[PDB]
């Protein structure tokens, strides 16, 4: 906004985005599906939920 050899001035525009939480969850586990093998009419088959 101003530029002398002994003086300066600047302006900065900052925009902020604050997420407001509804609930916070701390003690958490990841799921790992393993399933089960089934041997049916000769064929081996992997079964999963």
């Amino acid at each position: 906004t101003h530029s002398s050899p002994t003086a300066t001035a600047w302006e900065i525009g900052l925009y902020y985005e604050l997420v407001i939480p509804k609930h916070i969850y701390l003690n958490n586990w990841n799921v790992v599906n393993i399933g089960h093998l089934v041997k049916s009419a000769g064929q081996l088959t992997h079964v999963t939920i």
């Binding site: 799921v31 790992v32 599906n33 393993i34 399933g35 089960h36 999963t48 939920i49």
Partner: peptide, 23 residues
């Protein structure tokens, strides 16, 4: 002379547990 190798018994303990629904 006659060298031989006689088998002698031993064992290792192996525990196993289940995984409900496979999860």
């Amino acid at each position: 002379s006659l060298r031989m190798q006689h088998p002698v018994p031993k064992y290792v303990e192996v525990n196993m547990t289940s995984i409900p629904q496979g999860v």
